[model samples]
Target chain A: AHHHHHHMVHITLDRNTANSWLIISKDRRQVRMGDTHQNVSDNKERFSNYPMVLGAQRFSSGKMYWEVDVTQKEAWDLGVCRDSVQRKGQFSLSPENGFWTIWLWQDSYEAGTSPQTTLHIQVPPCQIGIFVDYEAGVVSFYNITDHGSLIYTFSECVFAGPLRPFFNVGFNYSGGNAAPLKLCPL
Target chain B: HHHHHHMVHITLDRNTANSWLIISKDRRQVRMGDTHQNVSDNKERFSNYPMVLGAQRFSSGKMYWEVDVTQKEAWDLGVCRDSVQRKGQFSLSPENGFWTIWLWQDSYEAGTSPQTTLHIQVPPCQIGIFVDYEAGVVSFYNITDHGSLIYTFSECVFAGPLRPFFNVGFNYSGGNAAPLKLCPL
Candidate 1:
């Protein structure tokens, strides 16, 4: 039973790693797009190219699950990455780059592969469940509705170092998809 | 007796509702906006957008449910695919991932993608919804009468599993405080 091994892992946003156009929540668990850009000091740890952020905690082993709320947003990118993943300059969001994440665009759920792959999920997930079994080298995604239907899974994932949750809020699009990318608590 | 027919009871997820709506304590009944509890203006809550969604979701299999539309001047109930935008001004149509029927004052309309308005002989006090996932047909009934057919959407390609959606037309104002109760049986 794949659902039998479900585990919830609480995580929060890494404000230090969020991009300029993104707004981190007060509790550091939610990140949304801000209308105006904020003037901050030049930091290398911050994402300067893509609108993204990492988790406050890192996982090295064992199974862990986390849920994200993507209610009103139009597009989003989520999954996990090695702590050593590129944080500066322009980089491809591929597994080859130590990043394994899924993205949503116009009702299409796709994984960011070297050439990208489309996921065969019809409905847009309002709440997404992310599962990672470190020792098994597997990372799975699920639509957390009804009884947790599996969305996609990545197997034989080569995990070298610590892996942390990765997120990209996508563009603000005026006020179209301005909804925040929230990290659900438990 | 080949098909063992059953009824699926549904409840509203208060968290997925807009601020302009009030759900009953039992979670089976809901109405348009509460003047006192209309608090948050957060866009995520559908406060500005205005909508209420069900907690349970279904992908396949034949499903049937009923709604108590008694004492309501305007209301809308139907199944919506999760892909449909719950945040903006959306249309209730097959093309938009919604197969819904609405009642506004005296006119009964099916908000199809092309927006077709239907004229009914009798107003449905209790509406019955029957959907065949494999066949892709959504039929509404006037359960208040004799289970007469109000409309049937044939050849619907269900993109994915669907959730029960309810909308109390307009707002809480203009004496539209009637609650659209999800019938238990």
Candidate 2:
């Protein structure tokens, strides 16, 4: 559980890359879905089709760990994507498409691999820890509430360039999923 | 300046808030309201004071947090023991398990036994609170003025967990209606 402490890094949400439907906290440590679309400038880095945001920090070659508080959030996505991934339109969230993520939808967990991989977890994690080793071509997710049990690992990742932490707040579903995704300190 | 690497995210605990204070949806902001909202009674809640405590607790190590008090006329900010009195009228001081500072009218004062008056040329828009549990030190900083030291409470005998303490003064007919926001790192 404490192995990732040496490589822990602070993660903050990037407001410039946030979708108009997402509301980022002033401290940039939390993100949630808002009812009304925000008045935002059009930029290549911003997501137009999805309620998502990227971490301000980018990684190219190092091992780093960060934890996210997903308590009370029914639907959301967490992972890393290439810095140059598509942001203007809908796209498949697969490694070949420069995206590797796991999402919760309809009370089930699934990884964004080719043909998707379903995750069977005994205890729903309130907090999740994401660890990435760019040099080793590995990305792992842990269920912090379950004593840091392994959730899933993406091995042999052929990272083309710098990658940023990806997040999708998912659908608000009439305020059912209004809780904010908080970036927790290690 | 960099001693506080453990910057924990602090959210106001709604269960401990007074019925007269309105907490934001994000749980990071609180303000006083004219009418008291209908809230369930609880032992942990403040019955007579417009106060609230942070959800996160600290028993050891150094922790830091900043609050945006811009344009606020009256407020209280600091740390108090987890088991401090929450259901009665008690004066704030080290003897009462609260080490805090406040702003009343145009004057600033530390929550000492005989409150220490603070004189400053410029008003602070943001305040930073830093605590070293082991060292028994609680220091307040004026973040608006280059993070200058405002006051320090030393030799504190903290026996249990410490929670961030906050008190929003009366609204006074839209005079101090602005909320106290917990600043991000």
Candidate 3:
């Protein structure tokens, strides 16, 4: 049986997990690198090296879909992560670390997992669609502009905890990473 | 059925283009300036306002075009009398010689005093804008949604050839940067 199902989840970047160099908008829908480090409290939930943030909404089991507008900038990441994923330390964004994300660095783009691989990804997705079927143990990414063509999929995965949408401007960069990673509205 | 036909082709008049607008090379798509770099410093460039004029003018033919307004939180589009002022910010209304429709997530309206609220089952992502030059009428359609009629203006006298108009919209505060894309065929 095929289940053509999906749910739109409202997502906002977690300020607590954001680093001092990350500038989150007041509406909480967009995140980008700031020119200066913010004088915020150094907390455990905040990222130490990269400008990464988790979603405010968490899902335990279900199918969900979300889109992000990554128009101009070349470096960024978007996907799902287990709540237990580390936030304070610099770590590999592989699936083994509870992080499954696609990264775009400069002109090259690829997905990060336990054993990462490059994505031919003919037409770069100006807008990306991420779909997760927790019950089916599947996580799929798509180039939304190409009528939802499958960019990559992780099947036969085992879930241990609630997973949430994740986003990042990759690792440390300078004043050059001004392009925003916007969370598109449903 | 004057509404069921292709009226006139439209293009953006780069001269009146605002600094915060990105016009596609094909002169079709117009969206917010995601990047603040390289915006024109021309004296006529609207630094304080956000707007652009269509490259063509109409005094006799009925014209129509589709606008891909996908996920836009706020925007305004239509036609303005050729004589309408473009130098400074001003009120947008028929009295101001501008016939247009505006969208604000929760509500949409035409530019008029005591504007009427437009209701639709689903907010349109693709909108059809039409103008009957000789008959003196301007109408808007929700082409890609419920095929609903959005708004209309009757007996609009053309002071001169009416020029198409556009506005990418104000950010206000929420960091809403969705571009106002004009659907190209």
Docking class of 1: incorrect
Tens digits of per-residue lDDT for model 3, A1-186: 113224767788888888777888999998887656777887887776567888888889878888888887767878998988887533567787787788786466777864556788788788888888899988888887777778888876666799978888743222245688888887
Sort the candidates on TM-score, descending order.
2, 1, 3
Q: How would you encode candidate 1's per-residue C-alpha lDDT over B117-182 as one tens digit per residue?
A: 786777778888888888898888888778888888989878897888888765312346678888
Stretches of model 2 off by over 4 angstroms after superposition: B1-185
> What C-alpha lDDT values do all the predictions have?
0.77, 0.85, 0.74
Per-residue CA lDDT of model 2 for A1-186, tens digit only, reads: 548868999999999899887888889999998866788887899987668899999999889998899999888899999998988644567898888788776577888887678899999989989999999998899999999999999999988999999998876522468898999965
Q: For model 2, what is the error of residue B25's alpha carbon versus the real structure, in angstroms, after optimal superposition? A: 50
Question: Model 3 fnat?
Answer: 0.00
DockQ (C-alpha) of model 1? 0.01
Place model 2 in a CAPRI quality band.
incorrect
- Backbone clashes in model 2, listed as residue pairs: none
For residues B36-64, what per-residue lDDT tens digits would candidate 2 score against the true structure?
A: 56778788998756789999999999999
List, in order, the clash count of every candidate structure.
2, 0, 2
Going through the candidates in order, their DockQ values are 0.01, 0.01, 0.01
Q: Write down the worst ten-residue block by lDDT for model 1 chain A.
A: A1-10
Worst 10 residues of 1 chain B by lDDT: B41-50
